[PDB]
Every structure is written in structure tokens, then in C-alpha cells.
Design a protein around this ligand. Structure first.
Ligand SMILES: CSc1nccc(C(=O)N[C@@H](CCC(=O)O)C(=O)N[C@@H](Cc2ccc3ccccc3c2)C(=O)N[C@@H](CC(C)C)C(=O)N[C@@H]2C[C@H]2c2ccccc2)n1
Length: 336
């Protein structure tokens, strides 16, 4: 494909045109100029649309990757977000979605492309900023990129995702999403990010309404007849519960929203992920806290956890047994 070289040259030429204008319109050089290049007048959206389509095939990605395809599409997305900010211009939205879909495809299963995209810091900052965009379609695409970047990432990529504030932005985004399709991609990204380190977990917990929102995902009613939202929301909660266990205020938010009760209902789910997530959360919340220990005893948790210790699923067996052990080791005074 020399068609691919031609498409990339088109995008680089346009970016070159934009970096000329931008270098004469930095924040300090504060008086503006009316001729700012518009991508509509360089036929840009069709170019990235073709690259996006071809990025679905691995054979075409090997080609793109030799030719600098990831760098060019990222720069394009960066430069348009920098130039026009959070616009509702349908052309600029569409351009961003297609570029974002291409980057989702080019990050898929490619640890170097993930690091390269992460190393492009201005692009990352622009990606993160787009979670505020009023297009939920754009939000879903951006969440899908941050998801792929956060799965099986190297140390620098994980560091970068943290530094640019992707965790907080995603959690705040999740609170406003209407569509189940956007929420699915936002929570997948968060579930990936929540496993990386303790600071990501703490940043999720530190957003106002986030913990209550996460407890709410445990009883989400899917229109699309899937359990993805309960699974991913319950997964995030499980990962952050290690820190919640140490924070009486955060436990109280969980109590406010009947968390423990719902988690015990989850123990009798047929979804293995739901059961495993609940075992894991209950493992953490059953430790170090007489109030929650007593509530679990009162709500029949001991017997419910005992029914899962012989599970063939290993995380359920381990999780249920460790939670059971925490309750047996700390009987309340009214028990003997
Ligand atoms: C290993 S299972 C799993 N569990 C939790 C999280 C993830 C995860 O983040 N997986 C990503 C990255 C994998 C990797 O880098 O090795 C992933 O698999 N992404 C896929 C979509 C996908 C598939 C399966 C699962 C399972 C569980 C959770 C999440 C996902 C996500 C991906 O990006 N695929 C692209 C197509 C390939 C052929 C390249 C893709 O979806 N491209 C579409 C153009 C993008 C798009 C974006 C938004 C809206 C419309 C279209 N894994």
C-alpha cells in the first residue's frame, strides 16, 4: 500500500500546516489570526476514515506502523483538540472519533504502540480532555483507547496514564454518562486502571459520589440483556475495597447504599465474575471492622460463604474461605 503512504502524507501535510499556525499562536503570543486551517477544507476526515477502516486488519497495521501511522493520527487528533477545544462541530467530532478508533486498533495487543502513544504526552492530555465532550459517541471511543492503553501496559505507560489524570477524568465521566454503550467502555478502562496501583484506587475513591455510583452499578438494569456493567462496576469496587476497608467514611458510604447486603445476593449469582468480585470485596470488608463483621453475621454471610469454599473456580474458593475465616475469627459479643 502506497495509498497508505499517500494518506499519511496528507495527514502530516495538514498537521504541518497546523503546527505552523500553532507555533505563531502559542498561549503567550496572545493576539490571534483569522486564517486558522480547518480540516474540512483539506479533505481530512475521509483520509482518517480510510486509515481507520484499514487499521482493523493486522496486515495493514504492520504497514502503518512502519510508516509512522500511529504518530501521525495521534498528532492529528492532538492538534485538532488543541486548536478547536471542546467543540460540537460535527466534522471535528467525526474526525476525532475516526482517529480515536484507529488508535484503539493500533494499540490493540501492541505494547510498543501503547508506550509510544503514552509517550506522546500532549496527545494523552487531549485524549483525557475529550471525556468532557458532549458527544457520548466520542466519549466511548476515548474510553476505548484509555482501556487498551491500560491493559497489560509497561511501567512507563502506567505511570503516564496516572500522571495525566485519566482515572479521575474517567470516574467523573462515568457519573454523567447516559448510554449503556459509553458506560461499558468507561468502566472497562477504570477496571483496568484500578488494578495498577494503590494511587489509582485512592483516586477512584476520592471522587464525590463515585463510591455510591459504583455500589449502584451492582444493581444496574441492562436494556441490552448483559451483565457487563454489574461485572465491571463490581470489579472496580473489588479492586478499590482494599483501601475502603481502612476508611470508615468510605465504609459508611457503602453502608448508606446497602453494599454488604447486595454483595451477599451476588454470592448466589450464576455469573462467575459477579460471584468472584463479591467474594473479593467481602474478603476485604470482612477484615479490621467489628461493625461490618457483625452486619455480615446478622445477614447470614457465614452460611452463604461456606457454600462457596468448595467451588471449582479458584478465586471464589479462596475469596469465600478467606472472608469466612475473617468472620469466624471475629464473632460479635452477642455470638459465642
Ligand atoms: C483479555 S480480556 C480483557 N479483560 C479486560 C480488559 C481487556 C482489554 O482492555 N482488552 C483490550 C486490549 C487487549 C490488548 O491490548 O491485548 C481489547 O481486547 N480491546 C478490543 C475490544 C475488546 C475485546 C474484548 C474485551 C473483553 C473484555 C473487556 C474488554 C474487551 C474489549 C479492541 O480494542 N478491539 C478493536 C478491534 C481489533 C480487531 C483491533 C476494536 O474494538 N476496535 C473498534 C474501532 C474501535 C471502536 C471504539 C469505540 C466504538 C466503536 C469502535 N481485556
Amino acid at each position: 500500500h502506497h495509498h497508505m503512504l499517500h494518506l499519511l502524507e496528507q495527514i502530516r501535510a495538514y498537521c504541518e500546516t497546523c503546527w505552523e499556525w500553532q507555533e505563531a499562536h502559542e498561549p503567550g503570543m496572545d493576539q490571534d489570526k483569522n486564517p486558522m486551517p480547518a480540516p474540512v477544507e483539506h479533505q481530512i476526515c475521509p483520509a482518517v476514515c480510510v486509515l481507520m477502516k484499514l487499521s482493523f486488519d493486522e496486515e495493514h497495521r504492520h504497514a502503518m506502523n512502519e510508516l509512522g501511522g500511529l504518530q501521525a493520527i495521534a498528532e492529528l487528533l492532538q492538534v485538532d483538540c488543541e486548536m478547536y477545544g471542546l467543540t460540537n462541530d460535527h466534522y471535528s467530532i467525526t474526525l476525532r472519533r475516526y482517529a480515536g478508533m484507529a488508535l484503539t486498533n493500533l494499540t490493540f495487543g501492541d505494547v510498543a504502540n501503547k508506550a509510544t502513544l503514552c509517550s506522546m504526552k500532549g496527545c494523552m492530555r487531549a485524549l483525557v480532555a475529550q471525556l468532557k465532550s458532549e458527544s457520548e459517541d466520542l466519549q466511548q471511543v476515548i474510553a476505548s483507547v484509555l482501556r487498551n492503553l491500560s491493559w497489560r501496559a509497561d511501567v512507563n505507560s502506567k505511570k503516564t496514564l496516572r500522571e495525566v489524570g485519566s482515572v479521575k477524568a474517567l470516574m467523573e465521566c462515568a457519573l454523567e454518562v447516559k448510554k449503556e454503550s459509553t458506560l461499558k467502555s468507561v468502566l472497562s478502562a477504570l477496571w483496568n486502571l484500578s488494578a495498577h496501583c494503590t494511587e489509582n484506587k485512592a483516586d477512584i475513591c476520592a471522587v464525590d459520589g463515585a463510591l455510591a455510583f459504583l455500589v449502584g452499578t451492582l444493581t444496574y438494569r441492562s436494556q441490552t440483556n448483559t451483565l457487563a456493567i454489574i461485572e465491571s462496576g463490581g470489579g472496580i469496587l473489588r479492586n478499590v475495597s482494599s483501601l475502603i476497608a481502612t476508611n470508615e467514611d468510605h465504609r459508611q458510604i457503602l453502608r448508606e447504599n446497602n453494599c454488604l447486603q447486595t454483595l451477599l445476593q451476588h454470592l448466589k449469582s450464576h455469573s462467575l465474575t459477579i460471584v468472584s468480585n463479591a467474594c473479593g470485596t467481602l474478603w476485604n470488608l470482612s477484615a479490621r471492622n467489628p461493625k461490618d463483621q457483625e452486619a455480615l453475621w446478622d445477614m447470614g454471610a457465614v452460611s452463604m460463604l461456606k457454600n462457596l469454599i468448595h467451588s471449582k473456580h479458584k478465586m471464589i474458593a479462596m475469596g469465600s474461605a478467606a472472608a469466612l475465616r475473617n468472620l469466624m475469627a471475629n464473632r460479635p459479643a452477642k455470638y459465642k
